Design a binder for this molecule. Structure first.
Ligand code: Z5K
Ligand code: Z5K
Ligand code: Z5K
Ligand code: NAG
Lengths: 533, 536
C-alpha cells in the first residue's frame, strides 16, 4: 500500500486515492463518513457524530447524494445536468471529501471548506464543477467539501418540536466543520486557518454560520458567492415553516399532534416527500424554495437582518460577490415567454406578468413601483430591454441587493470586506447568449476547471482561472486576496461604506468600481420595505 | 390733428388713438401703450368678470404705459436687479386693464402675424410694461405685431367663492380672453392679421396659455401656442373649488369679513386694495415654495374639468404648440424659503437641510411620498455631499413644478394629434446678476426671446446678439407657419417635433441646435406615473 494514502483520523483508518491533476498528482479521500446515517427514525433529526470503525475504510470514491428533487426541464442538456446528481440518491448521504497535495503538505496548510448551493433543495459535493484537485495541486491548498441534507430531509421543521426542530441540514454542515477541526491536521491541514466558501444556497449557509455563535469557533474567514443569509429566499419564519410542514404532511396523508405527524412522515418513502416538495409554496414564484432554514431563535437567535443589523464583526474578514446576470437562469423556469431556445423577447404585458412572479410578496402597488423603476422610459416597449429588465429585477431582488446590504452592514460594523462582480461568460457555456453570465458560472473558474485540457477552454481563460484561484487562496491564507508579491494589477481595495469599492473579475486586469447598484439597491433595500410596512 | 405724425394716429372700436414712434437699434417702431380694453374693474366690479371698455371721445394719448394691476411687491433683496426687474414699474392700481401694441414703422401693408404675450408672476404679480417684455425688437427686427396686456392678479384676479355671482373665480383669465377678443376686432387697424394669432407666455403666463387651449370659448381667438416654463396641469397652476373657497373665506376673516357669500364679498369690496395684498400669503395650507394663494380655480366653467383630466382625454390635431424649459427651473425658489439657501453664499446644504427642504418644496406630499422623493434624488454614493444636495434640492423643485408637468403636457398633446416642438434653454446670461450656483434660473430665457441683447447699452456679448436673433427667428417662424424652422436656412440643424416614439427636443444655447431624446424621462416617470399611484 501507499503511505501517502493511509490516514488515521479519530474514527479509524482511511485509504485515499492518488489522482492525476494536469500538473501533478494529488491525494484524495472521498466518501468519508462524518455522521451516523440519518435514516429511519433519524429522519429530520439533528446529526450524530459517526461511530468508530474497524480495519481500513475505503475512501477512494464518492459517496451517495443526499435525497433531493432532480431537474428535468431540459433532459440531457449540459447546462442543467452539470448541477444534477452524479451518484445514486440516498438518505444515507452524510459524507465528506478532502483533497490535498501529493505528497501531503509538509507544514500545516490553510483549509478551504466548500459548501454547495441548490436552493437548499438540491446539490452535492461530487459535482465535477466542485472538483478540488486543481486548487490542491496548483495552489497546494487542502480543500474539504461535505454533503448536507437538503429539501424536506434537511429543512422540514415543526418549530419547537423535539423530533423535527429544523435547520438540521445546517447542523450537518456544522458537524463537518467540527470534523475538520478534530481531524484535518492529520492530512496536513491547519485547523487554525479555515476559510469557508459557498455559492447560492451555499453562500447563505456560510452567512448563517457567521451568524450562529456555535459555529464562530470552527472557522476564521468566509467567502459568500452569489448568496446571503439575509434576503427574500434564504429563510422562513417559524410560522411559515410550520405551515409548509403541516401542508406537506396533509399532502401525503398524515391532522393531530407534532409527534404523531412526523411519525407518519418518517414512514414515507423519499420520493413521496419530494413528489410534493414544491406544492407547499404560498405563491406561484421563482427563486423561491420550499424547505429552507427557519428562524428558530436557536441556530438563528433572530432574523439574519436583525442579526447583521447589530452584530459586531470586529474580527471578521469576508469576500462577497455576484455575477453579471444573476436573474437570467431562473426565468426559463416558468416565467411566461422565456426559454433558452429563443432570444426570449417579451412584451410589456409579459413583463408585468413576470414581475408578480419574481416578487411574489409584492403588493399591487409594490409591483407597480418595480415596473416603473425598471422600465426604460425611452424604450418602454422595446422587447430586448423588457427581457433584460426581467432578469435584472429577479437578480437584484434575490441576490445583488441582499449582497450589497450585507457588505454595507458588515463593513460598517467592523468587518473587513472585499467585493467583486464576475463579468466573464464561459467560452464553452451552453446556455444562450441572452442569459449573459448566469447564476453559478463563476464556479468552474474558481475551482480551476479550465486547466482541464479536455474541457476545451481558451488559454486566456486558463490564465484567468489561475488568477482567481490565487485571489481565493491568498484570501484563505491572509484574509486579503491581494498577492503579497504582486505586482499587477491595481490592487483590490476593501469595500467600505464611504467609497463602496468593488472590482470586476474579467479577462482584463482588475478595474475598481464604486457603488454596487447603489441607486437601484437603495430602492430595494430602503424604499420598498416602507412600501409594505 | 393736423401737425402730428400721420403714422401714429389709428382708430379702434373704442375711438381714436395716438401712439408713439420709438427708436430701436435698427430703426423706428410704432408703439401704442395703455389702450384700455375693459371698463376699470373697480369698486363694486372688484372680483367681477370684466366689462368691455366703453368708447371714448377725442384722441386718446397712447404714448405711455398704464397702471400695474394691484399686487404684492418683492422686498427680499432690496435694490438688487435680479429681483427689481420683475417688480412693477408703474403706479399700482385696480384700474389697470390696458394693452400695448408694437408694430413696424410705418405699419405693414400686408396683414402681419400677431404675437400675444402674457406675463407670468404666479398670478400674484406681473405687468406687460416690464422692460424684459419689450416688443420693440421683435417688431423692428422680425416685422412682428406684438400685443402684451395687463390682467388682474392676486385676490382681484383669482379670489373665488365658487358657484356665486359676486366672485365666480378666474376673472384674471377672463381679462385675458377679453384682450384676445380686442385683438380680433381691432388688430387689423395696426396691420396685424387676426387670422394668424399666436399666444405666448412664461410660467403663469405659460399656464395661462395652456388654459385658453383648454377653455372652449378661447379657442377661436388664437391659432398657435407657446408655453415657456409653465403648464395648466401641475401642482401650482390651479386649485379645486373647495380649496379656493377655503382660502377666500380665510382671507375674509384675516381682514374682518366674517346673501351668504354675498355679504362676505360685499365686505371684502370695502377693503383697501392694500389690505388685501398685505394678507394674501397667509391663506396657504402649508409652508411652501412654488405655491401661490390665488390661482385659477377648476370651476367646471372656464375649466370644465381639471387640466390633468383635459389633456388626458382631448383631441388636439389642430394644435401647434412650442413648449420648453430652462436648465435650472428650481434654483430661484430656494432662496425664498428653504433654510440653507441664499444668493449671497454658495448654499451648500446638509442632508438634514435637504430632507427639511423636500417637505417644503413638495408641500402636498405625505411622509411616504417624501421619503420616495428623497430616495430618488439622493446619490447613494455621496448621500451627504453638500454640493450634490444643494443641486438635488433645486431639481426636486424644478422637476415637480415645471420640467415634469411640461414633460407630461408634451407627452399627452403629441399622443393626441398635436404638433409639439420642445426645447431646453441652457444659456446663462453673461449679464445675469444671480450667483453661479443657480444656473439658468426660471425666467431668464425671456430677455433673449424678446431680443434685449440687441440693446447696445445692455452690455451683452456679440455671441448673445447672434443668439438672441436666432431665437426670435424661431419664435417668429413658428408664429408664421407653426414650424420654428427656416425653409431658406435649410442647411442648419433641423428642429424635429417631439413625439411619443422618439421624445426628441433641442438644446438652446450658443452652439448650433443639438437634438436630444427624452425630457428627464426616467425621473418624470417617478413624478408623473408613480407618485400619483402612491396616493390614488
Ligand atoms: C464541469 C461541467 N461538465 C463539463 C465538463 C462536467 C460533466 N458534465 S455532466 O456531469 O454534468 C454530465 C454527465 C452525464 C451526462 C451529461 C449530459 F450531457 F447528458 F447532460 C452531463
Ligand atoms: C448551484 C447553482 N445552481 C445553478 C445555477 C444550482 C441550481 N440552480 S437553482 O437552485 O439556484 C435554480 C435555478 C433555476 C430554477 C430553479 C427551480 F427551483 F425553479 F427549479 C432552481
Ligand atoms: C414669472 C417671472 N419670475 C421670474 C423667475 C418672477 C418672479 N415671480 S415668481 O413667481 O417666479 C417667484 C419667485 C420667487 C419666489 C416666489 C414665491 F412665491 F415663493 F415668493 C415667486
Ligand atoms: C456697461 O458698460 C459700461 C463700461 O463699458 C459701464 O460704464 C456701464 O455702467 C455699463 N452699463 C450697464 C447696463 O451695466
Amino acid at each position: 500500500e501507499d503511505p501517502q494514502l493511509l490516514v488515521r483520523v479519530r474514527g479509524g483508518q482511511l485509504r485515499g486515492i492518488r489522482l492525476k491533476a494536469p500538473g501533478g498528482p494529488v491525494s484524495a479521500f472521498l466518501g468519508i463518513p462524518f455522521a451516523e446515517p440519518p435514516v429511519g427514525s433519524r429522519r429530520f433529526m439533528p446529526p450524530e457524530p459517526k461511530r468508530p470503525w474497524s480495519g481500513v475504510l475505503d475512501a477512494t470514491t464518492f459517496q451517495n447524494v443526499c435525497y433531493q428533487y432532480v431537474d428535468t426541464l431540459y433532459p440531457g442538456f449540459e447546462g442543467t445536468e452539470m448541477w444534477n446528481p452524479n451518484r445514486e440518491l440516498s438518505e444515507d448521504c452524510l459524507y465528506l471529501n478532502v483533497w490535498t497535495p501529493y505528497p501531503r503538505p509538509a507544514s500545516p496548510t490553510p483549509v478551504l471548506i466548500w459548501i454547495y448551493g441548490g436552493g437548499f433543495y438540491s446539490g452535492a459535493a461530487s459535482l465535477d464543477v466542485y472538483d478540488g484537485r486543481f486548487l490542491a495541486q496548483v495552489e497546494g491548498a487542502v480543500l474539504v467539501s461535505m454533503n448536507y441534507r437538503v429539501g424536506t430531509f434537511g429543512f422540514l421543521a415543526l418549530p419547537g418540536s423535539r423530533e423535527a426542530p429544523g435547520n438540521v441540514g445546517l447542523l450537518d454542515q456544522r458537524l463537518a466543520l467540527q470534523w475538520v477541526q478534530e481531524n484535518i491536521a492529520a492530512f496536513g491541514g491547519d485547523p487554525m486557518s479555515v476559510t469557508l466558501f459557498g455559492e447560492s444556497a451555499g453562500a447563505a449557509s456560510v452567512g448563517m454560520h457567521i451568524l450562529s455563535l456555535p459555529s464562530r469557533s470552527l472557522f476564521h474567514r468566509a467567502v459568500l458567492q452569489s448568496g446571503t443569509p439575509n434576503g427574500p429566499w434564504a429563510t422562513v419564519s417559524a410560522g411559515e415553516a410550520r405551515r409548509r410542514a403541516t401542508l406537506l404532511a396533509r399532502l401525503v396523508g398524515c391532522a393531530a399532534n407534532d409527534t404523531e405527524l412526523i411519525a407518519c412522515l418518517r414512514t414515507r418513502p423519499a420520493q413521496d416527500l419530494v413528489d410534493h416538495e414544491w406544492h407547499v409554496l404560498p405563491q406561484e414564484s421563482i427563486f423561491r424554495f420550499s424547505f429552507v432554514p427557519v428562524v428558530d431563535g436557536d441556530f438563528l437567535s433572530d432574523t439574519p437582518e436583525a442579526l447583521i443589523n447589530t452584530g459586531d464583526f470586529q474580527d471578521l474578514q469576508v469576500l462577497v460577490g455576484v455575477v453579471k446576470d444573476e436573474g437570467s437562469y431562473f426565468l426559463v423556469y416558468g416565467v411566461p415567454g422565456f426559454s433558452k431556445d429563443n432570444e426570449s423577447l417579451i412584451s410589456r404585458a409579459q413583463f408585468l406578468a413576470g414581475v408578480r412572479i419574481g416578487v411574489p410578496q409584492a403588493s399591487d402597488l409594490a409591483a407597480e413601483a418595480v415596473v416603473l423603476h425598471y422600465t426604460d422610459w425611452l424604450h418602454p416597449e422595446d422587447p430586448t430591454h423588457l427581457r433584460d429588465a426581467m432578469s435584472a429585477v429577479v437578480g437584484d431582488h434575490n441576490v445583488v441587493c441582499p449582497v450589497a446590504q450585507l457588505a454595507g452592514r458588515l463593513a460598517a460594523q467592523g468587518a473587513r470586506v472585499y467585493a467583486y462582480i464576475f463579468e466573464h461568460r464561459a467560452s464553452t457555456l451552453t446556455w444562450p447568449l441572452w442569459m449573459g453570465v448566469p447564476h453559478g458560472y463563476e464556479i468552474e473558474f474558481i475551482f480551476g476547471l479550465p486547466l482541464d485540457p479536455s474541457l476545451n477552454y481558451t488559454t486566456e481563460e486558463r490564465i484567468f482561472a489561475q488568477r482567481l484561484m490565487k485571489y481565493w487562496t491568498n484570501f484563505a491564507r491572509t484574509g486579503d486576496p491581494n498577492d503579497p508579491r504582486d505586482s499587477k494589477s491595481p490592487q483590490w481595495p476593501p469595500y467600505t461604506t464611504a467609497a463602496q469599492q468593488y472590482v470586476s473579475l474579467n479577462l482584463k486586469p482588475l478595474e475598481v468600481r464604486r457603488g454596487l447598484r447603489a441607486q437601484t439597491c437603495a430602492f430595494w433595500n430602503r424604499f420598498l420595505p416602507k412600501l409594505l410596512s
